[PDB]
From a paper:
Interestingly, BWI-1 has an uncommon binding loop sequence with a Pro at the P2 position and Trp at the P8′ position, suggesting a unique mode of intramolecular interactions between the binding loop and the protein core. Here, we report the crystal structure of rBTI at 1.84 Å resolution and the structure of rBTI-trypsin complex at 2.26 Å resolution. Within the loop, the P1 residue, Arg45, is an ideal substrate of trypsin, which ensures the inhibitor's tight binding to trypsin.
The structure of rBTI is composed of 69 amino acid residues. Its main structural elements comprise a single α-helix (α1, residues 18 to 28), a central parallel β-sheet consisting of two strands (β1, residues 30 to 38; β2, residues 51 to 56), a binding loop (residues 39 to 50) and two irregular structures at the N-terminus (residues 3 to 15) and C-terminus (residues 61 to 69). The Cys4-Cys49 disulfide bond stabilizes the binding loop by connecting it with the N-terminus. The binding loop of rBTI is a convex loop sandwiched between β1 and β2. This water molecule mediates the interactions between the binding loop and the protein core, stabilizing the structure of the binding loop. However, in the case of rBTI, there is a Pro at the P2 position instead of Thr. After superposing LUTI over rBTI, we observed that the binding loop of rBTI was approximately 3.5 Å more distant from the protein core than that of LUTI.
Author numbering: 3 to 69
The structure:
């Protein structure tokens, strides 16, 4: 079971770099990783990782979550 804030629906539509910094400030246990929308990721579960999926303009398009 993870601790701290688990999802950031409010960051959809923000620049990926800005989102990553907010995420890491708001939950000190996680690393945000900015990747293109649709990028293949490992199918494991972690409490210290937040995928930040962005469109071709570098803007967050999926809700970042701890996973």
């Amino acid at each position: 079971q993870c601790s701290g804030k688990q999802e950031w629906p409010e960051l959809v539509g923000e620049r990926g770099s800005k989102a990553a910094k907010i995420i890491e400030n708001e939950n000190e246990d996680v690393r945000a990783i900015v990747l293109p929308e649709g990028s293949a990721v490992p199918r494991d579960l972690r409490c210290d990782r937040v995928w930040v999926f962005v469109d071709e303009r570098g803007v967050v398009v999926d809700t970042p979550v701890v996973m």
